Subunit: 337 residues, 3 copies
């Protein structure tokens, strides 16, 4: 057998202040509960559990609304804390060692990318999501941070981000030409404006319907990593998949990716040999029935396994078992006498 | 932003005598209950609620079976009543103003098309359905009117329709060359005979599998509206979609259209700028679980929004919010000092 | 109308010793309970019920584990019993008469193919499954016979099958070049080794994603029956279909075939005019909710109907009903006076 990645790191980030629905903090445990670790090992990969990042959760009286944003100071404090740990993990392993991150709501992405970009500043980002998550604070109708994580990272958008002192440590590390969306089907108007204005590459479900997922992946990589020179940060919101496949998530949107389409994305990104960080966001075991949570867990595991290099086409055994070395009479041997 | 249709009309038709399962009369309310109106408004479209048509529901003793048909006199009386109102609405708005109609079982289609054809006699019809709904009375095994609505409209079939005095006002206004089916997977034998005999264009799920939905739509329009000269009556039976997507309907048939395929049909028809009337039939909130009804409602809303011109690719904002006119210090401005 | 097959045989095999989960013995009854027979008749086909094969179910004390295998002696005794009956049925009908077989777990396949190959030795096999079912006894982690049925049949694998006296009657009748897989997504490593080593044709879900089901079917037939000269044994594991479509099965694996893709396989194989035996395995009415069992039953019926030649494009009536021979006044006739 052969493997692009022979070892990987696992990191849990139970962020739950990016959106009002409680349960995303149970995200990392939902994956740890599963047979994910067992399965990755059987594929011949050494997965090291790097524990969980403790997010900063201020008391409501310590964190009033600022510019409509909810839990903004918790966000800024958590962001920096994420960035510090991710940077350490990335520099420590600097045939690479991918970081698998499990959220947690998507607001964590500001921290992960920032820390990732501090170790590999030339990275590109593949954002798999039903939503843009690129609302700027004054344009956000909800005030939820999981809908704004990209806006603090994109240089071309900094004249639309309100200055806040606790936000100074969060320096924009992304050019608009380094991001590519796949799976969009619920963009806010101002997101659509910014995405088109600054030429951010995006492939919606409409594009997936007209082009096919195979062409979309090829075009997404062509746009942000044309010669596979750049490290890849793969940000995978679980709600990019259709709700029939992953119902246990906060903002489900019908008409999403099939599990197979999602797997194709991960398999292709994995095969570049350039997967640096994969993050899975918006898992919420407190939403839906037990069967719903089981379905969502199952989809998450298959997706993450795909990122680490698992092939549906099969894997060769690390040692071939021969029947005669075990001194056992085979049927072929019996009739030969 | 730009819009093909800037205003539209909403009309409810709670027909429930076209089929034995009670609940389709709650169809229009299921859509009114939803956020459909709110969402259409946010897309920049003025939706006017034109109320509901009161269908004629005779007492069983007033409406005995005739030629196997159930509730035939209720059908004829209701048909004419539908036709009168639809004609008024169409002539009143004669950049068009589309009519959105929500049923109600599919027997209403005889009335809507008749009234529509009275204002726009050169119309073509796109029938999205698992079934032909073109059984002639003596060939119908069930005797349900929702399985015969097209047969009273097609000129080439009038030698197969039993003469009834109360049916005189229902004059065939459709040539067989004006109809195109998409989504068929449960045709009765005599429907298959008539469809092939008179050269009615039809694309079954088999065709969708072998050609892809994109080619099917193009071929369907090519067959009945080759140069986008004709107004389009879009008759959308909800059971055309797969039961996994829309379970709350009377005659569900496995192996149907995905939500995405259905959306593609509506998006393309909408983009012709020729959508005159869109009708959605066979919603039944009294079938299946609450989650089933929620799923069916959700699918209906996304479909109808697609007809009115909603793009999954995003919509531009009607006014761009600038951070400096609001007199707020942006991060870009702060560092520039 | 026209029909490739005008008559067919139905045979139930309630095998339940190939896997630990009880309920697959209720498989044949689940199909008999359905409207399958009624529907096949309406398509104009004479289905003869050939009853059920009574599988051999030894007492645990009579059937200890041998080489890790569970219920191996029950397997060998049952296999021979299956083979004897299938051979009789095949020679008896030797425009062919297809055998429709309903399991029962997939361990029955050793018996059916053996008996089938005894009447038509030049047959090819189309294996539709999430799994290879080609584990050799010493390589099997589970020791379940439903995971090994193919290994006893493939000549190239006989040096990997442990000699057992009760297994002598089971002679390998298949060359590796006569088998083609469709739908694989959960191969064991040693299966992957054997499949690639001996050049067995296989198309995984990855292949289905990149090629499309239409190309996969064409390539599968090209590999094992290039000129439609060989009779076809179609072995269809229900878990080849996605769990959303067929949840009531023992080893469900996400990311499977849609119902439409499965139907395409059956429709194409049927259209060769070379369908000799179709078997449906792994139905288990004791797994999942009532709605789950209903969904699984429904999928099974549509699949089997497709094998017998049912077209979603419609069937012509065996006698056209004219309105005037019945002495009834048509609307066309009324206005003509
Ligand atoms: N426009 C919405 C987008 S929410 C999407 C959140 B997510 O992608 O993380 O699930 C908002 O600003 O809250
Ligand atoms: N052959 C059936 C067709 S029923 C289809 C009804 B509908 O398309 O409206 O759900 C019949 O005549 O009742
Ligand atoms: N590797 C597994 C495969 S089980 C597949 C069983 B079946 O295809 O019949 O559902 C085993 O040896 O038990
Ligand atoms: Mn999202
Ligand atoms: Mn997100
Ligand atoms: Mn229908
Ligand atoms: Mn209909
Ligand atoms: Mn299987
Ligand atoms: Mn199997």
């Amino acid at each position: 057998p052969k493997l692009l990645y022979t070892s990987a790191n696992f990191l849990g980030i139970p962020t739950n202040r990016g959106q009002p629905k409680i349960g995303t903090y149970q995200g990392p445990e939902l994956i740890r509960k599963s047979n994910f670790f067992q399965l990755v090992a059987e594929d011949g990969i050494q997965l090291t559990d790097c524990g969980d990042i403790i997010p900063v959760e201020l008391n409501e009286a310590e964190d009033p609304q600022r510019f409509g944003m909810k839990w903004s100071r918790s966000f800024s404090l958590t962001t920096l804390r994420i960035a510090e740990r991710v940077e350490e993990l990335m520099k420590q392993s600097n045939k690479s060692t991918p970081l698998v991150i499990v959220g947690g709501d998507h607001s964590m992405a500001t921290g992960t990318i920032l820390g990732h970009a501090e170790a590999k500043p030339d990275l590109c980002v593949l954002w798999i999501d039903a939503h843009g998550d690129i609302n700027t604070p004054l344009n956000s109708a909800s005030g939820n941070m999981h809908g704004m994580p990209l806006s603090f990272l994109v240089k071309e958008l900094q004249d639309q981000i309100p200055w806040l002192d606790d936000f100074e440590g969060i320096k924009p590390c992304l050019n608009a030409s380094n991001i590519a969306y796949i799976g969009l089907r619920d963009l806010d108007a101002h997101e659509t404006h910014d995405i088109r204005k600054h030429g951010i590459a995006y492939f919606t479900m409409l594009d997936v319907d007209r082009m096919g997922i195979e062409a979309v992946i090829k075009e997404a990589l062509l746009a942000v990593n044309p010669r596979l020179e750049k490290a890849i940060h793969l940000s995978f919101d679980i709600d990019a998949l259709d709700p029939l496949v992953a119902p246990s998530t906060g903002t489900a949107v019908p008409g999403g990716l099939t599990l197979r389409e999602g797997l194709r994305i991960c398999e292709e990104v994995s095969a570049t040999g350039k997967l640096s960080v994969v993050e899975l966001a918006e898992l919420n075991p407190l939403l839906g029935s037990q069967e719903d949570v089981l379905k969502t867990q199952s989809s998450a595991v298959h997706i993450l396994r795909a990122c680490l290099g698992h092939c549906r086409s099969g894997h060769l055994p690390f040692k071939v078992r021969n029947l005669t070395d075990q001194g056992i009479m085979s049927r072929a041997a019996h009739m030969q006498t």
